[PDB]
Design a protein around this motif. Structure first.
Motif, mmCIF file in Angstrom:
data_model
loop_
_atom_site.group_PDB
_atom_site.id
_atom_site.type_symbol
_atom_site.label_atom_id
_atom_site.label_comp_id
_atom_site.label_asym_id
_atom_site.label_seq_id
_atom_site.Cartn_x
_atom_site.Cartn_y
_atom_site.Cartn_z
ATOM 1 N N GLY A 90 12.158 12.376 -0.774
ATOM 2 C CA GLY A 90 10.966 12.194 -1.575
ATOM 3 C C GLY A 90 10.752 13.244 -2.649
ATOM 4 N N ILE A 91 10.924 14.517 -2.311
ATOM 5 C CA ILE A 91 10.726 15.574 -3.292
ATOM 6 C C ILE A 91 11.751 15.473 -4.418
ATOM 7 C CG2 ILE A 91 9.626 17.159 -1.683
ATOM 8 C CD1 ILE A 91 12.316 18.446 -1.199
ATOM 9 N N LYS A 92 12.772 14.639 -4.215
ATOM 10 C CA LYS A 92 13.820 14.410 -5.212
ATOM 11 C C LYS A 92 13.494 13.124 -5.984
ATOM 12 C CE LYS A 92 18.029 14.849 -3.288
ATOM 13 N NZ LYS A 92 18.986 14.780 -2.137
ATOM 14 N N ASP A 93 13.190 12.045 -5.271
ATOM 15 C CA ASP A 93 12.808 10.775 -5.900
ATOM 16 C C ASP A 93 11.731 10.162 -5.019
ATOM 17 O OD1 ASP A 93 12.379 8.189 -6.770
ATOM 18 O OD2 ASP A 93 14.470 7.783 -7.254
ATOM 19 N N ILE A 94 10.482 10.314 -5.439
ATOM 20 C CA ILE A 94 9.339 9.815 -4.687
ATOM 21 C C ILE A 94 9.517 8.414 -4.113
ATOM 22 C CG2 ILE A 94 8.111 8.671 -6.520
ATOM 23 C CD1 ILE A 94 5.582 10.195 -5.398
ATOM 24 N N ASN A 95 10.452 7.657 -4.680
ATOM 25 C CA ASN A 95 10.718 6.294 -4.240
ATOM 26 C C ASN A 95 11.790 6.186 -3.165
ATOM 27 O OD1 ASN A 95 9.033 4.524 -6.144
ATOM 28 N ND2 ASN A 95 10.139 5.835 -7.597
ATOM 29 N N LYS A 96 12.169 7.299 -2.543
ATOM 30 C CA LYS A 96 13.187 7.238 -1.495
ATOM 31 C C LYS A 96 12.698 7.816 -0.176
ATOM 32 C CE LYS A 96 17.587 6.753 -3.848
ATOM 33 N NZ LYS A 96 19.055 6.823 -3.536
ATOM 34 N N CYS A 97 11.388 7.976 -0.041
ATOM 35 C CA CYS A 97 10.839 8.535 1.183
ATOM 36 C C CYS A 97 10.334 7.466 2.128
ATOM 37 C CB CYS A 97 9.702 9.491 0.862
ATOM 38 S SG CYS A 97 8.273 8.693 0.142
ATOM 39 N N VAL A 98 10.768 6.235 1.911
ATOM 40 C CA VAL A 98 10.343 5.146 2.768
ATOM 41 C C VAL A 98 11.550 4.631 3.529
ATOM 42 C CG1 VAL A 98 9.491 2.776 2.804
ATOM 43 C CG2 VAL A 98 8.422 4.465 1.330
ATOM 44 N N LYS A 115 -0.770 -6.418 -14.064
ATOM 45 C CA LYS A 115 0.224 -5.616 -14.746
ATOM 46 C C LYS A 115 1.166 -4.975 -13.729
ATOM 47 C CE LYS A 115 -0.728 -3.730 -19.336
ATOM 48 N NZ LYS A 115 -0.782 -2.429 -20.076
ATOM 49 N N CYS A 116 0.592 -4.275 -12.754
ATOM 50 C CA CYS A 116 1.377 -3.595 -11.733
ATOM 51 C C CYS A 116 2.133 -4.567 -10.847
ATOM 52 C CB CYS A 116 0.474 -2.715 -10.870
ATOM 53 S SG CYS A 116 -0.440 -1.441 -11.788
ATOM 54 N N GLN A 117 1.532 -5.714 -10.582
ATOM 55 C CA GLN A 117 2.184 -6.699 -9.739
ATOM 56 C C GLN A 117 3.503 -7.130 -10.312
ATOM 57 O OE1 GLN A 117 -1.205 -9.417 -9.699
ATOM 58 N NE2 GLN A 117 -1.115 -9.205 -7.458
ATOM 59 N N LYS A 118 3.504 -7.366 -11.621
ATOM 60 C CA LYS A 118 4.686 -7.815 -12.340
ATOM 61 C C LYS A 118 5.719 -6.708 -12.338
ATOM 62 C CE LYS A 118 5.861 -10.183 -16.771
ATOM 63 N NZ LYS A 118 5.926 -11.623 -16.339
ATOM 64 N N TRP A 119 5.265 -5.498 -12.650
ATOM 65 C CA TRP A 119 6.141 -4.340 -12.697
ATOM 66 C C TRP A 119 6.878 -4.144 -11.373
ATOM 67 C CZ3 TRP A 119 7.464 0.329 -10.712
ATOM 68 C CH2 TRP A 119 8.239 1.148 -11.556
ATOM 69 N N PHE A 120 6.155 -4.232 -10.262
ATOM 70 C CA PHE A 120 6.780 -4.073 -8.956
ATOM 71 C C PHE A 120 7.686 -5.244 -8.610
ATOM 72 C CE2 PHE A 120 3.167 -1.152 -7.773
ATOM 73 C CZ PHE A 120 3.971 -0.024 -7.620
ATOM 74 N N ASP A 121 7.389 -6.433 -9.126
ATOM 75 C CA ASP A 121 8.244 -7.579 -8.841
ATOM 76 C C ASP A 121 9.594 -7.331 -9.494
ATOM 77 O OD1 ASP A 121 6.915 -9.484 -7.190
ATOM 78 O OD2 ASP A 121 5.617 -10.029 -8.868
ATOM 79 N N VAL A 151 6.354 3.370 -6.319
ATOM 80 C CA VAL A 151 5.279 3.969 -7.080
ATOM 81 C C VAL A 151 5.425 3.774 -8.576
ATOM 82 C CG1 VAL A 151 3.935 6.029 -7.415
ATOM 83 C CG2 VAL A 151 5.310 5.783 -5.353
ATOM 84 N N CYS A 152 4.302 3.686 -9.272
ATOM 85 C CA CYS A 152 4.335 3.579 -10.720
ATOM 86 C C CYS A 152 3.059 4.172 -11.280
ATOM 87 C CB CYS A 152 4.527 2.137 -11.190
ATOM 88 S SG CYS A 152 3.169 1.023 -10.896
ATOM 89 N N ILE A 153 3.074 4.454 -12.575
ATOM 90 C CA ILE A 153 1.926 5.058 -13.223
ATOM 91 C C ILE A 153 1.790 4.604 -14.657
ATOM 92 C CG2 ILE A 153 2.012 7.128 -11.799
ATOM 93 C CD1 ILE A 153 3.394 8.498 -14.208
ATOM 94 N N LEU A 154 0.809 5.176 -15.341
ATOM 95 C CA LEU A 154 0.549 4.856 -16.731
ATOM 96 C C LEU A 154 0.964 6.014 -17.649
ATOM 97 C CD1 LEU A 154 -3.041 3.347 -16.402
ATOM 98 C CD2 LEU A 154 -0.898 2.098 -16.492
ATOM 99 N N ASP A 155 1.527 5.676 -18.808
ATOM 100 C CA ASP A 155 1.933 6.684 -19.784
ATOM 101 C C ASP A 155 0.754 6.904 -20.740
ATOM 102 O OD1 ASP A 155 1.701 4.740 -21.696
ATOM 103 O OD2 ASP A 155 3.836 4.244 -21.716
ATOM 104 N N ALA A 156 0.931 7.729 -21.770
ATOM 105 C CA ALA A 156 -0.164 7.979 -22.708
ATOM 106 C C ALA A 156 -0.621 6.710 -23.457
ATOM 107 C CB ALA A 156 0.222 9.077 -23.694
ATOM 108 N N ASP A 157 0.244 5.700 -23.543
ATOM 109 C CA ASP A 157 -0.095 4.437 -24.208
ATOM 110 C C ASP A 157 -0.580 3.412 -23.162
ATOM 111 O OD1 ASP A 157 -0.124 3.192 -26.866
ATOM 112 O OD2 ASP A 157 1.787 4.187 -27.228
ATOM 113 N N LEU A 177 -2.202 6.490 -10.088
ATOM 114 C CA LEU A 177 -1.065 6.239 -9.205
ATOM 115 C C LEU A 177 -1.171 4.843 -8.584
ATOM 116 C CD1 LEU A 177 1.301 8.082 -7.737
ATOM 117 C CD2 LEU A 177 -0.203 7.763 -5.789
ATOM 118 N N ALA A 178 -0.176 3.998 -8.827
ATOM 119 C CA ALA A 178 -0.182 2.648 -8.267
ATOM 120 C C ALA A 178 0.875 2.544 -7.171
ATOM 121 C CB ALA A 178 0.086 1.618 -9.354
ATOM 122 N N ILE A 179 0.455 2.101 -5.994
ATOM 123 C CA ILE A 179 1.366 1.991 -4.866
ATOM 124 C C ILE A 179 1.594 0.564 -4.386
ATOM 125 C CG2 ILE A 179 1.773 2.702 -2.508
ATOM 126 C CD1 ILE A 179 0.188 5.207 -3.085
#
Ligand code: ZN
Ligand code: ZN
Ligand code: ZN
Ligand code: ZN
Lengths: 572, 572
Positions: free
Chosen positions: B105-113, B159-165, B172-178, B195-197
């Motif tokens: 996780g501390i390396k890639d937050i998406n690998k701690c599951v 928005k997030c639903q599509k992104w995760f699909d 995990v996903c988040i929003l950028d400055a735009d 933070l979107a989970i």
């Protein structure tokens, strides 16, 4: 008055079954010392020489001679390769022995006598090849012996007889200066001039060939002694006295000794002990006797051979097929062919009396045959995985099914009785016709929860002439041959036995002017009901419009064949 | 409005039979990588979490996710010693895992599951012990999280639903400055604060426990971020927005994740797949159904249990004994005890349907039992080598024979039906009385070259009440029960089946005012003749002066016992 001393074979082999058993026991667990105890008193007026008895103990150390017996040392050379045995220099072999005797003789004249046996054992076939050899050397080969009788000296003979009875290890004896029987001694005989030999022959005026051995040793020891007295001492009345002189005709040593076989030639003897030691053969024996004995004490007019030689083809290796094959087997039948397409399922062993839990999922027909062979190894059991096409059924893969039709004929043909043991009416047609077109007795067995039907095809009607069950019939009755295989277990057992017992009564000659045989009636159809424990014997005439045995039908198949069979199968 | 965020178990295990089959296949041919494909769309309104399906392929490399599925890596730790499995530090184990996830996780937050499975397989009993664990770490253990709802943003959620699909490997996903959904990035979230989970729970307002993992990694990366926005995205309508703040209560890492068992406790789960994978059990199943099915479609009033639970003792393991045991077995009978003194002879296999050529010379009674167990392993078959003393016979070795008399009672006692399948009249006496003195139904089977006799003992007469055959009778008829065992093979088959089928009709309830049952009549005696294919049902009354069931006789044995039995045996 004179003549040339002629000889006779020293011994006669008598190899007992036990001897060959020991020989085997040793081959599984290359020279072997043998010892035999001779009995020069016990001699049949019919034999020519002392019998040499060999048994499972001649192999032993501690044999136990009886008073008056003469222990004789010998050996056996066993060969593992039959070719080596056959390809042995028989001559060089006996010569290599005679030499060994010659070496012992020049040391102790009483040790140049012995026997040898060469043999190859075929343990799997229980055959035994052997040849007994008694080393008899004559040296020099040129020196023969001229002889002339001397009237008996019952006194002298009795003297030597007693001496040899006591001195059981001596073959030769002589007289000392006080004329008393003593052990052979070159410088003594050289003066006393008398040689007494323990003869092993009964051939009138003809001593054992072993005489040659002793005379060869005598010549060696007393080169000058050329005139002496020979006494051939026998344990009875043939003992005779001879006036001897040593001639010569032109060191060379001729050797003889091989024993003549049963037929009368100088070759090996072969004994086949399978009918005695083959557990498989001893078994087959008893299976035979049970019947032989049965016939003999209860029904002497019964024909067993006929039943035994009937080649039976069983169509269906299910409940019926197993109980049927079982009964046939106990009647002597040796040719049984199983025809079943299915495999052994989990629910089969407890019902179909030929399978086990272990053989599930395996090809059924081929396993039934293997099963019979375990009961009786000599059975000629076979299994064919073939499927009988059903009536009112769309033809599938006509090519492979056409073959199935051809193969089913080759079977119904090479067999005498055809047992139709299928499930529904639909699978009885093709085989029932083919059997008719091929002139083969057909016995049908059909199961019904409560009942069963057993019947034979010829005039006599067949299975398709008239219907067996009516519609206006009992519920538990209409289940007959209705693809009903699960039933009260007892049904199949009874159906089967009656089918097989009907086949045997039927296989016997019929009494002129009657429909019976030595085994009883020969019904057309038998019908049993379990709920009331009853049986009925009905007979039905061939029906003119039967879709199977009717003249028109037979014609059709005869003229068109498959083309007709095919159409007949699909026709709904 | 505020509250402490509570959680729900992340997954629910669903281990398919195939999974346990693969597990076995591997144990015969200690960590193992597993892969599962999650489906966060297909979620029953009845479950609380995404189901984790494990099958024979989770073991495989190439699994093939379907569009929208989420691949999840995992592993299984197999133990060979049941004690080791039981005695494992469940806690230290899950902790040792959580650590591995923390390192990823501390390396890639998406690998701690990930998930884990500990298991012990009992291949012989087909039992399987396992425990699914989902490493869920909370660090620091003191830092809890305060939260307050935010009204929906169907726009943001979609928005997030599509992104995760699409981004199937991201949790995990988040929003950028735009304000566009992008991969989690510490320095970005640190400013965007959202933070979107991808949630795996359906529990209203309660996210998957895996949320703790991500928040633990979040805290590590952005120590200062203390106020943010949490979005729990679900593939349906439960997605909710949360106003979050990081509290603290007093590095320490608490770990949880073990799954609750069927009963509801935190322990291993145990699945017994024998009734599915035990060929022996699958077999027993069908043997049952054949009957169940038979009853159901043809005779629903038939009682099977009664027949099944009848303990049968067969006196004699010869021709009759084998055919009889065979029929009983197909009727469901599970307790059968063979009593025979002899050994299997060469002429037996072809006649006595339970032996083979290979088992000759072996103890007969014990081999019959072994034979049944090969047909059906679950049978409770037993063989006793005991000899029944005969009438009119000098007693021999009275001690050992006295024991034989005692042992014969202990047997006739522990059994319900007694089948008398001996050779001559002489061996039917002792067992027939003892059975009477002990109140046990007795069924007699007697063989005759041509015929057979089957009958039952009660009033109804017994075998010794009146004589069966007369002297002024047929030759081939007087052979009945006359030590005649060799007969036309069909006799025994029929005699046997009728004996067993009589026992079952007889075991059913009788219709009031009639001598029948659901299976039919219940004759006293049955008699079949082969020469004419017939049967007769006769009944005979208990005879007052029967040397076996007569009142005086019973009295005698009752008062004196052995003393009387003994005298009765020798009396000629
Ligand atoms: Zn000397
Ligand atoms: Zn016809
Ligand atoms: Zn960054
Ligand atoms: Zn009585």
């Amino acid at each position: 008055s004179e003549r040339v001393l002629s000889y006779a074979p020293a011994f006669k082999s008598f190899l007992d079954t036990s001897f060959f058993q020991e020989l085997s026991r040793l081959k599984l667990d290359t020279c072997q010392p043998l010892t035999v105890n001779l009995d020069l008193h016990n001699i049949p007026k019919s034999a020519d020489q002392v019998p040499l008895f060999l048994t499972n103990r001649s192999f032993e150390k501690h044999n136990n001679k009886r008073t008056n017996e003469v222990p004789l040392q010998g050996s056996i050379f066993n060969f593992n390769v039959l070719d080596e045995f056959k390809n042995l220099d028989k001559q060089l072999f006996l010569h290599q022995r005679a030499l060994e005797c010659w070496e012992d003789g020049i040391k102790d004249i009483n040790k140049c006598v012995s026997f040898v046996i060469i043999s190859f054992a075929d343990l799997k076939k229980y055959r035994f090849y052997y040849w007994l050899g008694v080393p008899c050397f004559q040296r020099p080969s040129s020196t023969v012996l001229h002889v002339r009788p001397e009237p008996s000296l019952k006194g002298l003979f009795s003297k030597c007889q007693k001496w040899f009875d006591v001195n059981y290890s001596k073959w030769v004896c002589i007289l000392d200066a006080d004329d008393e029987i003593v052990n052979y001694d070159k410088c003594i005989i050289r003066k006393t001039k008398v040689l007494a030999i323990r003869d092993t022959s009964t051939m009138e005026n003809v001593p054992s060939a072993l005489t040659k051995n002793f005379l060869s040793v005598l010549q060696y020891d007393v080169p000058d002694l050329i005139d002496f007295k020979l006494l051939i001492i026998r344990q009875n009345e043939g003992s005779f006295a001879l006036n001897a002189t040593f001639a010569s005709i032109d060191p060379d040593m001729k050797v003889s000794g091989w024993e003549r076989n049963v037929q009368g030639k100088l070759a090996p003897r072969v004994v086949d002990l399978s009918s005695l030691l083959d557990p498989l053969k001893i078994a087959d024996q008893s299976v035979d006797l049970n019947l032989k004995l049965m016939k003999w004490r209860i029904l002497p007019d019964l024909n067993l051979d006929i039943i035994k030689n009937t080649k039976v083809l069983l169509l269906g290796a299910g409940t019926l097929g197993c109980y049927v094959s079982r009964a046939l087997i106990a009647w002597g039948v040796r040719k049984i062919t199983f025809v079943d397409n299915g495999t052994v399922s989990y629910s089969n062993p407890v019902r179909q009396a030929l399978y086990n839990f272990e053989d599930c999922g395996k090809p059924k027909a081929e396993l039934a045959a293997a099963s019979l062979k375990r009961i009786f190894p000599l059975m000629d059991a076979t299994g064919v995985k073939l499927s009988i096409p059903m009536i009112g059924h769309k033809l599938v893969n006509e090519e492979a099914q056409h073959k199935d039709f051809d193969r089913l004929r080759a079977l119904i043909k090479e067999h005498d009785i055809i047992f139709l043991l299928v499930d529904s009416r639909e699978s009885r047609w093709l085989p029932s016709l083919l059997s008719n077109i091929e002139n083969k007795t057909v016995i049908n067995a059909a199961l019904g929860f409560d009942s069963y039907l057993v019947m034979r095809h010829g005039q006599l009607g067949c299975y398709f002439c008239h219907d067996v069950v009516a519609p206006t019939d009992s519920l538990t009755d209409r289940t007959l041959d209705q693809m009903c295989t699960v039933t009260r277990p007892g049904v199949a057992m009874m159906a089967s036995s009656l089918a097989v017992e009907l086949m045997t009564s039927l296989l016997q000659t019929k009494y002129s002017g009657s429909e019976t045989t030595v085994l009883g009636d020969i019904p057309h159809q038998i019908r049993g009901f379990l709920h009331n424990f009853s049986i009925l014997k009905l007979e039905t005439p061939a029906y003119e419009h039967c879709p199977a045995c009717s003249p028109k039908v037979i014609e059709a198949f005869t003229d068109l064949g498959w083309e007709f069979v095919k159409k007949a199968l699909e026709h709904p």
